[PDB]
């Protein structure tokens, strides 16, 4: 478990109260038409599993699968950005704190570097 | 004719003998000539002139690009993508042009031969050492660089071979 027992995590909290600072996935997000198609196509094989017209029957089905996917989707992506964020954050942390451990090297160029040929023959 | 430089692509000055004929029959190949020169070169020198008629009418220009030089690989930093790329695709180009550089003097040591005839061993010395220098300038530049070849390979290269030749010199003078 590496972010499992972080400082301040609050148990059974889907999306706590600092997530609010990050910038919200665009209701246009790929992401999300992605998770769109996903339920259009739950809907489709709903109607092909129950043997009704594939494209035409169940409309409103097909607008609630479409929905909730979205809807769960949505919060999903919040969520993922969230994690990857925090990772983010606690690593530019830990690296700012470990100055010995990450130092910074002399950057010497490609004149200056010997390097090996191998000839191709 | 100026749709070329001359000095780029020399060509030596032509002497035609003048012709002194020794019989009373007839120069067939006159003849035909005259009658080549009535019947295709003025119809196709008139349809050139309509077509050049037309042509200066529509006038219009295209340039040549102009690329100024950028930082090479032996002054671009370790792992600095954005100079690596700009050396690259300058190195990428300097090789093109050494590529057609080598074809112009391949062109011009083929035409020498041909129009020297049958004496091109002796009268085209003057281009063969030519070639024989831009060959062997560009077989050292770019002679087993590899299908993968970069400007960091071809530098490691030039190295090793400064390297080879630092040591040569530091013995010979030992
Ligand atoms: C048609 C699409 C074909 C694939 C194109 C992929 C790259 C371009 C995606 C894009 O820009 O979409 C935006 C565009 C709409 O977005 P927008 O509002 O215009 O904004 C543009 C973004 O700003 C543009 O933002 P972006 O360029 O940063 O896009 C970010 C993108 C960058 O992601 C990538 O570069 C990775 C793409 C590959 C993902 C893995 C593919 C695995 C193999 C394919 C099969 C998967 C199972 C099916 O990452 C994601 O979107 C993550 C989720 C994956 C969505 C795409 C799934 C493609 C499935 C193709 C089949 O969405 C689409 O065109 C398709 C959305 C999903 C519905 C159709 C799904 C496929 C249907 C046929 C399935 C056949 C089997
Ligand atoms: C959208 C097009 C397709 C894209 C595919 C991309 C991947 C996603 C798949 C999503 C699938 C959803 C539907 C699944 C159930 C389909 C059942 C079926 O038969 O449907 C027939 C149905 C029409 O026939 P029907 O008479 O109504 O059907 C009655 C019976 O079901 C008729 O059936 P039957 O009782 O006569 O039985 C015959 C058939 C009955 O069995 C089937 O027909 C197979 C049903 C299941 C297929 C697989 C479902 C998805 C599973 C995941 C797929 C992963 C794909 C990627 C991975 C690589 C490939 C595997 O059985 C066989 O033929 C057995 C021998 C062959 C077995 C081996 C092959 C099996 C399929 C393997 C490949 C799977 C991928 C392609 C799936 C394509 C599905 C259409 O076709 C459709 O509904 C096709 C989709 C139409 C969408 C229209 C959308 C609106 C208009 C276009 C808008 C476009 C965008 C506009 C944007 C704005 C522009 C301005
Ligand atoms: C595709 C495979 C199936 C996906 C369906 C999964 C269904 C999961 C069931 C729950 C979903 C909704 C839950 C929302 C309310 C509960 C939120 C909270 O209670 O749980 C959170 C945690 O739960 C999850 O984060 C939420 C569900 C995440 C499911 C994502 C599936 C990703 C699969 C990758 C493919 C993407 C599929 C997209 C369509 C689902 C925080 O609890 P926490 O105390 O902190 O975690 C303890 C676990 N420890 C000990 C290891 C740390
Ligand atoms: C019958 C089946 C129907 C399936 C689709 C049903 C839902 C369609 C949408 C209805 C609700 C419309 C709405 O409220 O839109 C709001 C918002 C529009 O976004 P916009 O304001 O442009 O945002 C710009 C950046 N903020 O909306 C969005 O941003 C939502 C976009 C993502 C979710 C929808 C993705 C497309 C639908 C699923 C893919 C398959 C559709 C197949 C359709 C076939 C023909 C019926
Ligand atoms: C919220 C307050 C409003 C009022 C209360 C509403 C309660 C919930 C709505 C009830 C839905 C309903 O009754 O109809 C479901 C319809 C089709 O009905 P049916 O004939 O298939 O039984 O369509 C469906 O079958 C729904 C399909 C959805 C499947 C589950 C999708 C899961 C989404 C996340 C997946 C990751």
């Given at each position: 478990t590496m972010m499992s027992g972080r400082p301040g995590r609050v148990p059974l909290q889907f999306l706590p109260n600092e997530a609010r600072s990050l910038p919200p996935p665009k209701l246009t997000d790929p992401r999300l038409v992605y998770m769109g198609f996903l339920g259009y196509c739950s809907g489709l094989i709903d109607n092909a599993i129950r043997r009704r017209?594939?494209?035409?029957?169940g409309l409103h089905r097909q607008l609630l699968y479409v929905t909730s996917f979205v809807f769960f989707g949505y919060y999903l992506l919040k969520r993922q950005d969230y994690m990857y964020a925090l990772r983010d954050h606690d690593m530019f942390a830990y690296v700012k704190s470990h100055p010995e451990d990450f130092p910074e090297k002399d950057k010497k160029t490609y004149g200056e570097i010997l390097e090996e040929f191998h000839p191709v023959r | 004719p100026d749709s070329w430089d001359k000095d780029v692509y020399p060509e030596p000055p032509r002497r035609t003998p003048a012709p002194a004929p020794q019989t009373s029959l007839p120069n067939p190949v006159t003849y035909l000539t005259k009658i080549f020169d009535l019947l295709v070169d003025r119809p196709v020198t008139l349809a050139r002139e309509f077509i050049e008629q037309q042509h200066a009418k529509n006038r219009y220009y295209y340039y040549h690009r102009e690329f100024r030089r950028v930082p090479d690989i032996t002054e671009c930093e370790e792992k600095d993508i954005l100079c690596m790329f700009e050396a690259e695709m300058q190195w990428r180009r300097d090789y093109k042009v050494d590529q057609e550089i080598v074809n112009i003097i391949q062109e011009r040591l083929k035409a020498c031969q041909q129009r020297e005839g049958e004496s091109y061993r002796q009268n085209c010395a003057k281009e063969l050492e030519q070639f024989t220098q831009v060959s062997k300038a560009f077989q050292d530049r770019?002679?087993?660089?590899?299908?993968?070849?970069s400007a960091r390979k071809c530098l490691a290269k030039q190295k090793q071979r400064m390297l080879a030749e630092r040591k040569a010199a530091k013995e010979a003078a030992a």
């Open positions: 017209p594939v494209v035409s029957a | 770019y002679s087993d660089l590899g299908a993968h070849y």
